[PDB]
C-alpha cells in the first residue's frame, strides 16, 4: 500500500523494467553522494525531498553494514555466514541501489527528463532483440 | 549522517530519554496508520516527515521479509532463534525512535514536541527522594 515513486510521478514498474546491470555499484553511489552533494546534504533547507530520501537511505544501508559485521563476528557455525552475507549484500542491496540511482539522477537533471528517459528505455526493451536498434538509449544531458 | 538534524533536534538531545520508556512497535504502527492513512495518501508533497515515515515503514517491511525468509530456510534451529531474537529486539530501537518522533510532530505541532523533549530530561535527573511523583506527558 506504499508507492514511493508516486510522490514524484513514477511507478515501481518503471524501474523494475530496468535490468540489474544498468545500476552502478554501491560504492560508486556512496562516493557520488559524498563528493558532489555533501555541502548542502547536512545543511537545512525546505522542500528538496530528494535530500531526505538520500539521507535515510545512507542510514539504512549503514545499519545493514553493521548487521553484516555483527553476524560475521559471532555466528559460530562456519557455513551459514556465506548464505547470510550473500543475501544481505547482493539481494537486499538491490533496492538500495535502485533508490539511490533514482534520487541521485533526479537531483542532477530533475524530473523533466528522467521520466522520458525511463519511458523510452521501456519502449526499447519491450521489443524483441531481433528488431531492437543497435544500442540502448543514453540519458545524456 | 545525522538522523534528525533538520528538525531542530540532535541525537544527543534524545539520549536523555531512556531506551525502556519508549512505546511498543505495533502501537506506533497502528497509531500512524489509523490516524494518518489519509495524510499518507495524497498528491501534495510537503512536511518531509511524511516521506520519512514512508521510508521507516519500508525499512520495517524489508526487515520483516528477511525475518520470514530466515524462518523458512537456515537449517540449524538455534542460529535461527538467535537471529530472530536479535531482529525482533535489538534491531527495532532506531525505527521505534523515528516513529515516535515523527508521529509526535505529526500529531500536534513541532514546538510542543521540542518543549516536551527538553522538559522530560528534568524528570530523570532529579533524585527520587524529592522528585515529583508523576512524569511529563506530551498532552494536547
Amino acid at each position, epitope marked *: 500500500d506504499i508507492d514511493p515513486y508516486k510522490e514524484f510521478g513514477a511507478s515501481v514498474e518503471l524501474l523494475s523494467f530496468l535490468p540489474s546491470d544498468f545500476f552502478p555499484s554501491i560504492r560508486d553511489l556512496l562516493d557520488t553522494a559524498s563528493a558532489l552533494y555533501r555541502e548542502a546534504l547536512e545543511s537545512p533547507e525546505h522542500c528538496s525531498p530528494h535530500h531526505t530520501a538520500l539521507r535515510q537511505a545512507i542510514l539504512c544501508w549503514g545499519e545493514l553494514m553493521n548487521l553484516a559485521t555483527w553476524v560475521g*563476528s559471532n555466528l*559460530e557455525d*562456519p*557455513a551459514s555466514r556465506e548464505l547470510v552475507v550473500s543475501y544481505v549484500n547482493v539481494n537486499m542491496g538491490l533496492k538500495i541501489r535502485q533508490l539511490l540511482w533514482f534520487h541521485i539522477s533526479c537531483l542532477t537533471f530533475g524530473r523533466e527528463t528522467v521520466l522520458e528517459y525511463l519511458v523510452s528505455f521501456g519502449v526499447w526493451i519491450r521489443t524483441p532483440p531481433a528488431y531492437r536498434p543497435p544500442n540502448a538509449p543514453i540519458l545524456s544531458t | 549522517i545525522d538522523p534528525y538534524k533538520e528538525f531542530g533536534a540532535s541525537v544527543e538531545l534524545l539520549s536523555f530519554l531512556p531506551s525502556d520508556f519508549f512505546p511498543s512497535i505495533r502501537d506506533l504502527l497502528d497509531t500512524a496508520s489509523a490516524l494518518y492513512r489519509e495524510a499518507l495518501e495524497s498528491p501534495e508533497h510537503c512536511s518531509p516527515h511524511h516521506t520519512a515515515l514512508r521510508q521507516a515503514i519500508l525499512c520495517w517491511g524489508e526487515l520483516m521479509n528477511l525475518a520470514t525468509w530466515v524462518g523458512s530456510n537456515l*537449517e*540449524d*534451529p*538455534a*542460529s535461527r532463534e*538467535l537471529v530472530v531474537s536479535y531482529v525482533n529486539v535489538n534491531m527495532g530501537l532506531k525505527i521505534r525512535q523515528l516513529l515516535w518522533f515523527h508521529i509526535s510532530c505529526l500529531t500536534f505541532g513541532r514546538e510542543t514536541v521540542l518543549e516536551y523533549l527538553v522538559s522530560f530530561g528534568v524528570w530523570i535527573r532529579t533524585p527520587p527522594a524529592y522528585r515529583p511523583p508523576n512524569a511529563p506527558i506530551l498532552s494536547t
Partner: antibody
Amino acid sequence: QVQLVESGGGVVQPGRSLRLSCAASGFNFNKFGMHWVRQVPGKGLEWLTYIWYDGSNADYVDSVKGRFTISRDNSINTLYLQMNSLRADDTAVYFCARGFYDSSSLESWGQGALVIVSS
Amino acid sequence: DIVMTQSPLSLAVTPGEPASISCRSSQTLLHNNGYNYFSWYLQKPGQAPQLLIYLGSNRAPGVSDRFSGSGSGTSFTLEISRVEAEDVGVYYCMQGRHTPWTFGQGTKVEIKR
C-alpha cells in the same frame, strides 16, 4: 532420521597404511560438517579432527598432527579418512558423526568400525 | 589446550533417588551470544553414544524429562530426579569453545551392592 554405515574396517599388517570408509545419506551433506571420534579400550572418547563444508580449512590434534588427512567428495556424499604411519597405540574403533546444534555438539553417531594391528 | 575435569569418578545410586554429577572446565564458555558451549553425552556398552543435554541447558530432542541440568560459566551439574534400571552407563562432558575439541574423563554409574 539419518542412517550412516561405515566400511573398510579390519586387521592390517604393521607398517602399512589403511583407509576407512564412512558414507552418509538422507540429509544435505553440503550444508553440514563432519567429525571423527576414536576409542581405544580402557579409556573414553577422544576428538581427532574435523572438516568444514567447503573443505578449504581443516584442523588436527597434536597426537596425529601431520600424519592423518581427511577429505570429502561432494559428488557422492562420502567421507574419507586416510591413515599413514600407524603405531601400536592407534588400535581402536573409529566413529564418524555429524553435529548441527549450532555447530557445537555431535548429534547423530555412526555405528563405527574397529581397526586392529598385529603380526 | 583446554584441561577438562570431572567428579566424582563413580557414583552408585539406589534407584528411585536423585543424584548429581559435576563437570568443570578451565576457561570460560560464555560467548558474546549469551550462550555457553557445553555438552552432556550418554554411552552404553556395545552401542553408539547418545545425547543428553544440548547448548548447556536445553534438552536434546526425544530425551526423557528425568534428566535435567543447569549452570553457567565454568561450573555445571547434571541432575537425574529418578534413577531407572535402564540408566546404567558411563557419562561424558565435552567442550566446544575453541578448537581443538577436548573430552572429559568419564563417570560410570552402577547399583550400590
